Design a protein around this nucleic acid. Sequence first.
DNA 1: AGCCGTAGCCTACGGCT
DNA 2: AGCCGTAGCTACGGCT
Lengths: 673, 674
Amino acid sequence: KLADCSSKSPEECEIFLVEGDSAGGSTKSGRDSRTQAILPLRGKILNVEKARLDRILNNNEIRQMITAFGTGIGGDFDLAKARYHKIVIMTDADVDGAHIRTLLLTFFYRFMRPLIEAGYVYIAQPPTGYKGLGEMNADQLWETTMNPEHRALLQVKLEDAIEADQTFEMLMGDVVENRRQFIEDNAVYANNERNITSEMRESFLDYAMSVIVARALPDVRDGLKPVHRRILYGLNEQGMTPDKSYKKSARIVGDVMGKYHPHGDSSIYEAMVRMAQDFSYRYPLVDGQGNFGSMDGDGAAAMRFTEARMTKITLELLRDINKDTIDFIDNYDGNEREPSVLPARFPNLLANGASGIAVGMATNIPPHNLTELINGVLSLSKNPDISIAELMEDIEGPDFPTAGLILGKSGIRRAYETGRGSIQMRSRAVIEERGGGRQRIVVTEIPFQVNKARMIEKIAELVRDKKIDGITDLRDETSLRTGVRVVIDVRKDANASVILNNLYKQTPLQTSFGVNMIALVNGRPKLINLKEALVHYLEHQKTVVRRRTQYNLRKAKDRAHILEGLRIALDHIDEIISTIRESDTDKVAMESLQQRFKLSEKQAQAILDMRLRRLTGLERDKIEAEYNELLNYISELETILADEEVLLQLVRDELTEIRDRFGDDRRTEIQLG
Amino acid sequence: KLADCSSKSPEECEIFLVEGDSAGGSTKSGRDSRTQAILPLRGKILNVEKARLDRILNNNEIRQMITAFGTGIGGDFDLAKARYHKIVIMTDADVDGAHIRTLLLTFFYRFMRPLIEAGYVYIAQPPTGYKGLGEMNADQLWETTMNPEHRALLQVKLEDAIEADQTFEMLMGDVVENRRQFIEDNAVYANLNERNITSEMRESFLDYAMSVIVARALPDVRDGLKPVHRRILYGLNEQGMTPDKSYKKSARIVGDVMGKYHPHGDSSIYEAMVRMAQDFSYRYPLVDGQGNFGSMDGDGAAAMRFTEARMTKITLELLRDINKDTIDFIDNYDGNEREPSVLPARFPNLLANGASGIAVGMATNIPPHNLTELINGVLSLSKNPDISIAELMEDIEGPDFPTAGLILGKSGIRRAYETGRGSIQMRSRAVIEERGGGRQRIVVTEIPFQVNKARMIEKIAELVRDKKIDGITDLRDETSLRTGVRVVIDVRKDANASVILNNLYKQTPLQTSFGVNMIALVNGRPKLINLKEALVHYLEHQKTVVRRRTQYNLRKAKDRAHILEGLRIALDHIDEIISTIRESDTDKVAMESLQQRFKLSEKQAQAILDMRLRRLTGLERDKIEAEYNELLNYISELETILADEEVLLQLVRDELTEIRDRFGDDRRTEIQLG
DNA sequence: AGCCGTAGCCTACGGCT
DNA sequence: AGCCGTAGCTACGGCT
Ligand SMILES: NC[C@H](NC(=O)c1cc(-c2c[nH]c3ncccc23)cs1)c1ccccc1
Ligand SMILES: NC[C@H](NC(=O)c1cc(-c2c[nH]c3ncccc23)cs1)c1ccccc1
Ligand SMILES: NC[C@H](NC(=O)c1cc(-c2c[nH]c3ncccc23)cs1)c1ccccc1
Ligand SMILES: [Cl-]
Ligand SMILES: [Mn+2]
Ligand SMILES: [Mn+2]
């Protein structure tokens, strides 16, 4: 992939390590090809601080870089053999580019340290902002970043080797907790010559913070990561409600990528596909048409071949969003507005769960039954001091979209009391007696997130390697009519219970869910227990409904004000018309109407905008009937805002309506205790 | 790769040859894995009627099929070794799926003919319509196409061997002209269980061939556009992507075009849009691109998620008056949208930007031209219907390439213009300089149209290496944005630089030919046309566009004047109007009362009822009367255009001259007299 | 020793000094 | 000849 330069005098030659194939092709066209070489890197590269020597040496990009430099590595490093005297790290001016920078410096420090000590390693300075290298043309990349006459390069400098050793070990090594403490202790600070320790700390902090608060962890209030929230908001802004026709996924994803989510379309589309899978989401948020994948790990077809829209339950996540219930923010480029959180009129975080690998931490929250969840929220609203054990009278435990069994309540109880616990998920399997003493095992439900075809291959593997005994045949007979159905035939000699018990132990036929409930609370990650998760969601609903009521109250008062001016005008229309006719301009008519009938500017404006058809008999009555209905509505809104109990009951009534409309039976059976 | 079935009893097993990877994955999931195997095909496959034996045997997809079947080929072929007793052709029910069917049947008939005679070859019958296989889920493909219990299969049968041999030879072989004659003869019959193989070949290839001719590879004579380019520019217009507005991500532009009008791969759409934004490809660029949009060295544009685009100003003239009932709209591919059959094209875009296209039975190759020269030619033609091509060449000297360069003589230009066909020699602009003290060098500043600069330089270097050219010391590409193209060729002292340059013309793309072959769609049919005929169809298109625009504006102006007459009556008797309205209980009563008391039409009584009170102020009253008086002169002016053909023709002349004055530019390519 | 989920071509077709 | 232009691997954490 290396596009070398024509010169062979290393002293004047420079190689640019460029993030991205798009930027790789543009820099190859914009470079001074006499003295500048380009090695494009696909994206994220191996972290050699966590990797074994065999994987480092056999890694393709590591090998391309060694071969391009010519120095060798480690002990065999020969600085005199360097083919370039400037090695220039050139990544996007964003958090992922900063991550690629920390990964490249980790490789140079552990395997080519004299390269750094000699001053040969540099960091390019492309234009900052939201536009990445791949979006610039070849002349721009030359004039701003590669041209020696104009560019600014940072020369990486090693000042303290002991401090650098500890910095690379802490940021890039296997001990997660020291890395997490560094992130937590510097979060407020997040997002020529360059000290390598300062570059590592500052670039890794920016990346790790952005992954934590703007990528991999869901918000406690609506249960969504930014990519999902932007998909669902984009469906709402595009009018993609369940009553409208399906829309091509490429159009949906392209709009979301351009307006809110400036990342690879595959990240957006695969997150949309998951929201449409009934084996992944307990309450699917997207309604898909076409091939959207399978339990067997099949991917969806390419997004130009599929279509989608919202499900009906997603309408409840977006409900009241245009009633100043949630704060909007500027998008990535300042050209759009996007919601910081969705109103989320059902507890989505616990309902559909969440899995996300961040930096310094990860999250793993199982899905739940929505009837149970809303019951728990209702019980909580009536008892702020409710205990977790009493909440478990409503919320028995997780409810997976793929059904199955859970073994005992001890794991469930641990997870709910502390945020962490190991939950054993077992497939639903029965042993059928057959003629001739024969037996067969029939599996109709498998654990959550288990790839069925893969599970079946594991069993086949054990049978092929003689690791298990007595299996005569293994068939996947799953169908649309029957659902999951995996059949295992047993030898007459064999005992089916022994085989089945061994299958739970050696295959994904039984798998554990490691609960680790971490979500963003007030924008920051916290490990939360079940009651904490329900309290933050209930507080979210009280704030949404309160803000909606205040919005509706503003709007009703403004309309009542307008109708008051309209009534006056209609009651004295001849006077009104004559005032307007004797006015030469709109401004004079406005002033004459306000001065004579003691109307407001808003009232006078509405009168001038009133059409002649409003002068008919039924119209006067229509205006009066709307006015009286508005007065009753204003009084009702004020009653809600005046009594916290009235507001809380409104929240209860609306949660109960959602429970009745969307609540469904528990699928996963919780065995024993 | 092949996804085999579990059973090894051939007579119960079936293999499906599935079009596309997406459909291949979903058929693998929806099939009966016991007895059904899937072999997905990337897309179009080798035509074995045109390929020699070493290319066929070396083809990966041919090999996979041969290995999957187990029969061999020949000759060395054995039916008893067949691994499936059903080989099912499963392609989209569209023209490209029909093409893949003809390609697969050609491989079976030429290399596995006893497979057909044995009855083992079948054609799947997926749901017809616009949705393809790749758009269906796994259960739909099973229930409609693969389930033995509910599916319909066509068993391919070979009735007459001689007829079949001739059919395969004509449709799929190398003699283009007999294939073209077949298309022309049966064109009327295009795109409107045992299945005869000859009938299947003739019907499926006709459908494909006709579609490529009339709705893919050839431009319309009136606006100079292929379907993909017309839908790109129409989409930019519907998305409001005018030059005044901000750039928009290309992935959004392409996604909308693909979902609304062009149900094909996004790469076809994007790459076509990219070409319209390159000033080395389009003499008058139709797209304004931001980001990396390629280079003369064959570099591709950046991926469409990284680039942005909008219209250029001149593209506004292709779309001007499109919403004035100047052109016919048609239903899109799925009936959910409307799209233009042709753009108004207020400048002659076919000849201005040219066209290149490879269809079936024919191809086209039309070079770009200077817009000032073209419009003067159309103006000359509008004043003299009997003007000759030689006289039109007094306006239109010849092609004008965006890459400038030289054309050697007028003899190929004149043949092309008189007949539609002719060879034109394009030569780079090169000068010989002195670089001290006795040394010389060749500096190339312009290269021929459609020539890859890097590829050309590599060719020269190839000659130097290989000692095919004796006198070159150095070869450098000093092209820059400021400099423009600049390729430097250093010559050895005392070596003749004139001799090396002349040899470089003869041995490299430094001199290259443009084979003119002016085929465009005229009345929906492909036609070889000379220069005058191309200009004649364009002028008739413009007369029709301006006439239809004038008719539309007149009806709109009469409607508006009619409404203004009602408002003026309401203003003259406003007291009566108000009283009449107040007196009425409902709007319907007010409507009826206004009509029967003031002799107003229903439309006028509605416009009065919709009149806002602010229209009653003094300035607003005068505005109604001032609009009406201006409208009456406008109506008179429009009726003069429609009453006299000469008046209409002069308006066409005036508006074409305004586009010439606004957009016309200097000739770039020098036509050297030789 | 891997798994979860957001991130960073070949070919048809015609013509041609 | 071969070309033109519209088509059909890794990071990260935590379990095991
Ligand atoms: N117990 C809390 C602890 N939090 C953290 O590790 C981190 C907090 C932040 C953070 C983001 N924005 C901020 N703004 C101001 C201050 C801090 C932050 C980044 S990491 C934890 C969470 C999850 C698991 C264990 C421990
Ligand atoms: N809408 C009920 C109505 N009164 C009014 O609306 C108002 C009118 C005026 C007013 C100020 N100067 C005038 N000069 C001419 C005309 C009106 C006015 C201010 S309020 C009414 C009034 C009396 C009886 C029934 C209903
Ligand atoms: N007549 C010249 C000849 N035409 C053709 O080869 C073809 C015409 C058509 C066709 C499309 N739509 C139709 N509708 C009715 C009848 C025929 C058609 C397909 S091929 C030619 C053109 C260009 C070059 C050589 C020969
Ligand atoms: Cl009158
Ligand atoms: Mn980036
Ligand atoms: Mn298709």
